[PDB]
Amino acid sequence: FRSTRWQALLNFNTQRRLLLTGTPLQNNLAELWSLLYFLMPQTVIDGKK
DNA sequence: CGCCCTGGAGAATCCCGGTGCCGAGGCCGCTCAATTGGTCGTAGACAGCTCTAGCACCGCTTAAACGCACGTACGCGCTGTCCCCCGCGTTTTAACCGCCAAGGGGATTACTCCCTAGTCTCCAGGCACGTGTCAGATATATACATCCTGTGCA
Numbered sequence: 001f002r003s004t005r006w007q008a009l010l011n012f013n014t015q016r017r018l019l020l021t022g023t024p025l026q027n028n029l030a031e032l033w034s035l036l037y038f039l040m041p042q043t044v045i046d047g048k049k
Numbered sequence: 050c051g052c053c054c055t056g057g058a059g060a061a062t063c064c065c066g067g068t069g070c071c072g073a074g075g076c077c078g079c080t081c082a083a084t085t086g087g088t089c090g091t092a093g094a095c096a097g098c099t100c101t102a103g104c105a106c107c108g109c110t111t112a113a114a115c116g117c118a119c120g121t122a123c124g125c126g127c128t129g130t131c132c133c134c135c136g137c138g139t140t141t142t143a144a145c146c147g148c149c150a151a152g153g154g155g156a157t158t159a160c161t162c163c164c165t166a167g168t169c170t171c172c173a174g175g176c177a178c179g180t181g182t183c184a185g186a187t188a189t190a191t192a193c194a195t196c197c198t199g200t201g202c203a
Contacts, residue, residue, distance in 0.1 A: 003147070011069085 001034045010038070 017039060024032055033047040 005146090 001030070001037065006034075006038070010041075 019035065019039065021035075024035060029047045033043065036043050
């Protein structure tokens with residue numbers, strides 16, 4: 001989430017997003033919630049609830 | 050046989066939109082030195098008076114400025130040479146980010162004493178000034194010292 005290319009790709013003009021990945025990690029919910037953030041920005045910052 | 054003038058080509062530039070991005074300025078919260086007045090004592094302008102070097106000048110007395118004539122030699126124009134850095138393509142490194150997060154010491158702000166010096170005061174003495182005296186530079190007697198002249202001679 002703290003990387004620069006994170007916010008670099010967020011402001012582009014698109015009506016849809018498609019993520020192609022092999023597999024994410026099981027634990028470390030921060031990166032899972034991060035991919036969920038970059039999917040669409042409807043998610044709050046609370047992953048610990 | 051080889052050079053100015055023309056034409057084709059190429060690319061570097063100018064200028065006009067076109068959309069994302071961020072700090073200039075506005076707005077507010079706040080807050081502290083400017084403002085107003087009074088007090089107080091103090092140097093600056095106004096004469097006052099004085100005194101002293103600048104001013105304008107006159108006339109010897111050399112001394113640089115100048116006009117010119119000659120001249121010769123280096124600044125300059127021209128020419129041949131050659132070599133060194135620019136233009137460009139290919140190689141090689143510096144720096145940014147991603148990972149993966151922690152502290153660290155030094156200027157800042159606030160508080161806190163404490164003691165060196167401003168201010169006032171009086172006592173003393175020391176260097177700017179007047180005068181004594183020798184050093185150096187100056188102008189003049191002087192005892193010979195070198196031509197000139199009577200002058201006597203062989």
